[PDB]
Amino acid sequence: MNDLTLSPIAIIHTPYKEKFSVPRQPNLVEDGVGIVELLPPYNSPEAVRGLEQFSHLWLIFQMVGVFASRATHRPNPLGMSKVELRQVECINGNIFLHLGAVDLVDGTPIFDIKPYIAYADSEPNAQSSVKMTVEFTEQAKSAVKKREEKRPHLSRFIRQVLEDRIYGMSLYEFNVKWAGTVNCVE
Amino acid sequence: MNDLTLSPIAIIHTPYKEKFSVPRQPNLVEDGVGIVELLPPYNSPEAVRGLEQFSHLWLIFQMVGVFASRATHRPNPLGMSKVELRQVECINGNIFLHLGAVDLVDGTPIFDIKPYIAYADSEPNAQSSVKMTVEFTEQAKSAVKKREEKRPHLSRFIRQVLEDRIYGMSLYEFNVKWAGTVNCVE
What we know:
homodimer, mainly beta, 2 domains, two-stranded parallel sheet, 2 helices, 34% strand, structural genomics, unknown function, Structural Genomics
């Protein structure tokens, strides 16, 4: 048993540009959706035949004791993530797996795509050891409105912030600065 | 984003010597237990500090469309497996994670060890699209009895077979040949 060299089979497109932009509860934010783009020569319709069968998927991507946590600094930076499968799209040799609410940062390399099977993967009783109101300033209400044309639902997409004081958060091409009041979207 | 070279961090010791020996329902067979042995220099007590907190673990090991199944022939032969954690043992620089009922074949290389968290990993409603009696011949009853000293519960460990006609199955150092009647344990 020797080493192993992995080849990225896909790239993930996501609203969260950096780690800080990812909410600790991605299943709540219904706009933090993603598209998995399969790279050549894995982007074949044969490679995803029947993927649309399953509703959930497992993505093996690239990122107390290390093994006791979910930290990224690992001997093998291999991360897991179960996302919702909304649509397997095939067009002109391009395969896009339109996922549900994800938690991977924009552009992350995918190593494997497996179907999430409830039998072998679900273990509910697995043991172990602050909803905020969102307000936009008038200038904010205006800036968000202008972008509602290109990126619809950009306003409610701010359920992230829903989890002196002028913090910054990069969402998409934007940089949103901010019960918290959001100042300027730019 | 380029390739990635993985280094095995551990080896898994298991009763099932080959793929055929693994029951399609490992959670039933209460003897198909395993020990994960951490390899140098990852076998440090600091690397598993508090692992005993969680009851379940994720092992990323080495193995319709490919992505639509759990097949082994993949662009990246990376497999997943959630096992029960019974005991994290530290002795003379040797770390053994005594698991519960596993499904990995004997000697399989482990790439990563993560704690199974019910929040992010459990998804019960995940959608998609024969109990047999066990009898031993007299010669078998004798052969199993002789080994009950070294490998206790070797008899009930045959709940595997519980899922002309002289089939063979390798379990441990043995080769069990066989409502089905098991002939000779050797």
